[PDB]
Amino acid sequence: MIIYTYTDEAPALATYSLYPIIKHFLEKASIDITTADISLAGRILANFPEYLNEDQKVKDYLQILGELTKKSDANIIKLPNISASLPQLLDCIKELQDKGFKVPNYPNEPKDEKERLIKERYAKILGSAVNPVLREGNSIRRAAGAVKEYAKANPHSNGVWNKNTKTKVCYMDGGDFYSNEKSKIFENSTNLEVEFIPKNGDKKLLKELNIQAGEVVDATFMSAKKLDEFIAKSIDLAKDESLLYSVHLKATMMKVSDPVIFGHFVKGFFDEVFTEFQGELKALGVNPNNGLGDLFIKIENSKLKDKILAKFDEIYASRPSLSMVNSDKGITNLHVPSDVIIDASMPAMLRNSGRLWDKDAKEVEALAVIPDKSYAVVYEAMIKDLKENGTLDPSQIGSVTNIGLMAKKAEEYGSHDKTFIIESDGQIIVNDSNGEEIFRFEVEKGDIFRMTQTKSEPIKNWVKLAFDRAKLTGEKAIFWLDEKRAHDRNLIMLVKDELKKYDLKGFDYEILDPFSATLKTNQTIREGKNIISVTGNVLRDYLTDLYPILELGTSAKMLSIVPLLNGGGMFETGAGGSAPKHVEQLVSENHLRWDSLGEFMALIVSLEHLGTQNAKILAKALDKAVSRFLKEDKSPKRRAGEPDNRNSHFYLAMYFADELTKTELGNIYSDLALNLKNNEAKINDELLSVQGKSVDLGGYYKFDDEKASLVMRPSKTLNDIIN
Template sequence: MSTIIYTHTDEAPLLATYSLLPVIEAYAGKAGVDVETRDISLAGRILAQFPERLTDEQRVGDALAELGALANDPSANIIKLPNVSASVPQLKAAIAELQALGYDLPNLPEDPQNDEEKDVASRYDRVKGSAVNPVLRQGNSDRRAPGAVKAYAKAHPHRMGAWSADSKTNVATMSGGDFFSNEKSWVSPADDTLRIELVAADGATTILKPSLPVLAGEVVDATFLSAKALDAFLAGAVARAQEEGVLFSTHLKATMMKVSDPIIFGHVVRAYFAPVFAQHGDALAAAGLSANDGLGAIFQGLAQVENGAEIRAAFDARLAEGPALAMVDSDKGITNLHVPSDVIVDASMPAMIRIGGHMWGADGAEHDTLAVIPDSSYAGIYQATIDDCRANGALDPSTMGTVPNVGLMAQKAEEYGSHDKTFEIPADGTVRVVTAAGETVLEHAVEKGDIWRACQTKDAPIRDWVKLAVTRARLSGTPAVFWLDENRAHDANLIAKVNAYLPEHDTDGLDLRILAPAAATTFSLERIRQGLDTISVTGNVLRDYNTDLFPILEVGTSAKMLSIVPLMAGGGLFETGAGGSAPKHVQQLIAEDYLRWDSLGEFFALAASLEHLANTTGNAKAQVLADTLDAATSTFLEEDRSPGRKLGTIDNRGSHFYLAFYWAQELAAQTRDAELAAAFAPLAERLAADETTIVDELVAVQGKPADLGGYYRPDGAKASAVMRPSATFNAAIDAF
C-alpha cells in the first residue's frame, strides 16, 4: 500500500486536521493509499525530550527524528502543516499546560547552574525556534501561487489600502556595525572539523563550539552585531519616529531566530523605555524581569515587585510622551513591544504595505510608520517596495504578475537562526573559527554584549538549487533572478558557485540574471505592474521573506501557496502554507466556535503529494485522485467556499464539507477509472441530497465557547467533537 505521512502540528492547522483528515483518509483509501500521522507539534516535541519522566501511557516517540530520517529515503512522501516555532514565552506556556495536564516536566531553567539544569536546558533548546523545518527540509524549495488561486485573485481582487505620495512610512536600518557589514565568508577546501572559540582580552580562551563538521566546498560564514552600534541606532530611530510624528514599530523574527532576535528585541524595548530602565533597571533585573521577554511579561511580573506600581507608572508615562507605538491589538492595549513573537517581520511588513503603509495606533486608527529592522541584510527589499508604492500607488491584484520562489534551504543551508552557533558575547575579546589543523579562517574583534553568529551552506544543496532554478525557468518561460549582492561576503561566494554551476545546464534562451536584493525587488515590481512574472531565486532568509511578501500582495495571503520541496534523495515534502495568524484563529474558535483558518494550502499540498506518489509508485488511482482534487479545488474557489469572516457563514469545517462534496462529484464523473467512479457516485449523491442539512448543522454550533481541553495539546476527543459537529456529514464519511 502506498503511504503518505500527514503531520500533526499546532494551533489552527492542527484543529483543521481533526475535520479534514477523516475525509482524506476515506478518499485516499479507495485508491489504495494509506495516510499515516506523525506528531511534530510543540507539545509532542517537548514530551519526546523527557521519556524517563513520563509514564508508559504518556510517553511519545520522537516523530521529528523519525521523519528526518525518512526525508533522506527516496520513498518519503510527507505533508507538513505549519507548526509553532516556539519563542521562550510560548515554550514556557506549553510546558505549564503540559504540567497542568499531569506530565512530570521540569521548568525551563532561566540560568542553568549545574549539569542537571544544563541538560534540561539543552533538551528544551532542541525544541525552541525553527526546530522542525531544518530537519525535514532535505531539499530546496519550489513555491508558487497555484493557477487556480491566481485566477481567483484576479477575478475577485482582495482589498488593498491606498498609498499616498506623501506617505512618511519608511524602514529604518543600520548603516554599520550590523550582521551585514561585519560578515566574513570562507569556503572549506576539504572535509574538516572546525571549532569556535573566544579569546578574551586577558588571553583566556573559551570554547564556544568544540566541533563544527564541514564538507569540501562548504560555505562557512561568520558575523556579529555590535551592541553599541545597535543601541546608538535604536536611540536615533526612537528620536526619528518622534520627530516625524509616525508610529514606532520593530520587525524581527524572535520565533525563528531564537537566540539573536529576542536579545535584539530586548535592546529595542530598553531603547524605547530608556528613562524607565535608567531609573528602575536594577529593580527589574533583581525581580527577574527581562526586556527580552517583552513589555507584557514585565507588566505581568510587576505585580510581585515591591514598588511595581511606581515602575508601571513610569512605563505608562513614557508611553504617553511618545513616540506613539504601533499596536498589535489596540483594543486590549497590546503594543508592538509587548511580546517578541507577536510581530514577525515576514508577515508584518507585507501586511503593513498591503494596507497603504500603515499600522494601527493606540487610537484604533491607521498611521504612517517607521518600521525598525536593525540588520540591513534584507531591510532594503521592504524599503524598495515602499518606495515603489509611494511613487506608483498600490498594486492591483486583478492585473499584477506573480513572483514564485526557488529557495536554497536543503541540509540546513543558510539556517539563519544558526541556533547552535549564535552567542551573546560575555567579555571583550576575539572570536575565531579554527580548523582542525589550528588555522584561523575567520575572526572578529568583539565586545561584551555583541551577538556573534556563524552559519553553513553545503555545496550539494547549492548545486541542486541552481539546477532547480534553471528547471523552473525552462518550464515557466519566465526570467529567473538570483537575489545575491556581490558586496556581501556570503553572497560573493555564492555568486562564484552559481557562475560555476550554470554551465552544467542548458540555459540557451533563458533570462537568468544576478541582482542585489533591493534591485531585484525593484525589477520584479516593475514587471509585476506590467502583469509579468519573475522567479526569485533566493537564499533561505529571502525564501522565507519573499514567499510572504509577494503572495500577500498578490493573493492576500501566503497560506494559499503551493509549496513543494523536491527532496534531494528523491522523495517529496509538501508544505501547506504559512500559519502566522493561527493563534488568533484559535482564540476565536474557543470564544465563538468559529474557525477562520483556510485549508487551501492543505488541498494543494495533498494534490501534489498524490501526484508525486502516483509518479513514484505507479499508482494510477492516486493520479486520478490528484487530478480530480485539483478540479474540485477550482470549483471550490469559483463557488467561494473558503471560510467567511463572520458568524453565520461557513467556517473551516464548512469549507471541508464543500471540498469533499466537489471532490466526490469529480471522482464520480471522471471516466479514467470506472471502479473509483462507481465507488464515489453514491457518496456524491448523498452529499448533494444532504447539503442543506449538513451546512445547517455546521453553522448551528457557532456563537458559543468551545472546549478543546488544551491549547498546545488539545484533548483528542474534545477537539474532534468540536471540529466534526455535523452528524450527517460524519455518518456519510465514516460509512464510506
C-alpha cells in the first residue's frame, strides 16, 4: 500500500489533477494507493470531532501515518504541508466556522479548564506538527542526473554578484543560542530535571526528561537585552548604508522561540507605537508576536485607530526601507510571522542579485538580519564567495547531495516542548536522578531558554548513510560541524567514534565548521565536481533550499529519500514547501506555475521501494517518461496564457503510457497511450483556454471538492480518458 499525502495550497491543488492520473496507472497495474488528509484544515477537523456532524469528521491521519512509519514496511509519498503560524491557524479556524464546521475559537487566555485543554490541542497543531512525527529516519536529498542535466541544458538566472554588491548578513555577537550553548553525551540512562530559581520568588520545575544511553542533550538561551540592542544596531546600520531592512527567521517550525524573536523585531522597529499605545494595544489584545496584520485587524475598533496609523507613517519615515512580501497590498516582512522563512527567503534574495523589494516594488540591496550566528555564517560565506567569484553558473556547477540528521525529532526540531520564556531574573539549573548539577545559566526576564535531544541510533545511522553514499559515488563528504559549539564538538567525538567501526580506505571526508564547509563546497562545485554535505537537522533544511535553488531554480526538483529505521520508506516530493504564492496566481488568473516534477520522482522511488514485478516495470518506464518530459521541456511556465501544472500532468501521462506500450504490460496501456497521443492538441487547448480568469475554489485551507476538481480538471476529453 502506497499512501499519497493530501496537504495544503499549491501541492493540494496539483493533487486534484495528478492523483486521478497516478491512480488510473497504478490501478491498471493492480498497485494499491490511497490519500491521507494531513492538510491544516483536516488536522484541525480530526482534532475537534465532538464539535462536528458525522460527514464533517476526519480520521487522525497524522496518528495513522505516525504508526505506519514504525511498521516493518511503509511506503509514504509526502508532499509539502503547512507548519502553521497562529495567524494561519486563526484564519483556518475562521474559514471552517464560516462553512458550518463548528470548531472552537483559539482562546489566547483560557477562562476555564475547558478553554485550557482547547488551547493545548491547537498548540500541538501549530508549527511543524507532521514532519517531526513522520521523520522516523534520516534524509538523503540530491538531484537525479536527468534533473541536473535539465538545469545545465536549460539554465535559470542566478542574477549578478561583484565586490560592488553591498548585500550583507547581520547576526548577534554574544547573547545568542550559539554563544550560551552547553552540551553533554550521556553514557547511561538518567532522568533530568529543569528548575527555575528567581532571585526573588519560589523555585519551579519547568521540565522532566527521560534521557537514554548515548543521547546528546544541549541547553542554551538568547538574551532579550542583547537581542534588543542588536535589533536597534541592525536597524541603524540599515539606515546608514541605505540597505533595505529584511528579517529571516523560522517562526513556523521554531513555534516557541521565533514568534518571540519576531515580536522583538516588531516592538523594536515600531518602538514609538508600542510606547504611545502600550495600554491601548494591551487592552485590544495585541501580541506583537503575531505581526502587523493581527495588530491592524485589532485596531479596526479603537478610538485611537487613525492616531495609531499616523504614528506608523512617522516611524516608516525615520526608519530604513522595510522588505515587502507584497508591495501592492502594503504587506511587510513584519505583517505575518510565516511569510518570510529563512530557508526559502535567503536564496530567493541571493538569486535576485542580493536585491529584495520596497514599498514601490523597487529591487534594492538588502541587509539580511539573522539573529543567531550558528547558521547565519553559512549565508555570510555564500555571500563572500559570490562577491569574490561572481554568481554560481547553473550550466557549469556540480551538485550538492545532503545527508541530514533528522530521526526522532533531532536537535532544534524537537526543542519546542523544551523551550521556555524566563518569567523574571533568576537562574536555570538542570539535574539528573543522582542530583548532579549538569547545566546552570544566569538568565533574565524575557530570555529564551532552550534544550535539545539527539539520540545515538539517529547519529549512528546518519554516519552509515554518508559513508555508504560516498562509497557508492566516490564524492568528497564534508561533515558541517563547528568545534566552537558544544553540541557540534560532541557530534565530532560521536562521528569519530562511529567511523572507527568502518574501513576509511576510499572514504574521502573532511570535518569543517559551516563557514569553511560552505567555501569548500562552493570551490568544489565551481570546478564542476559533485560534493556531499553531512549536516544537522537545520542545515539539512537550509542547504537543500540554498544549493538546489541556485543549481535547479526551486528545491522542489530534488529527490528526498527517508529510509525509516524500522525498514519503511518515506519519499518527499522535493525539499520545498507548499508555495502559497502559486495559489494567489491560480485564484486571480487560473494559472498554476507549481512544478510537480518532484511528485513524479518521489513516485518513481516509491515504486522501486514497493519492488513488485509491476512496480519495477512502472518505475523504469516512469523514469524514461520523466527523462522525455525534461528533454521536451514540459515543466510548467509562469505567465497566464502559457502551459501550466495541468498541461505538464498531461505530457507526463502521454509519455508514461507511451513508455509502458514497449514493456511486458503493453496490451494494458495501448489504448491509453493512443487515446492521449490522438488527443494531444485537443486536450492541450481544453487546459490552456480556461486560463486568464479568476476562479472560485470554495475556500483556501479547505476547498469545495466539486469546484477544485472543476478548476484543476477542466478538460472533458482528458477526464473521459482518465476516468
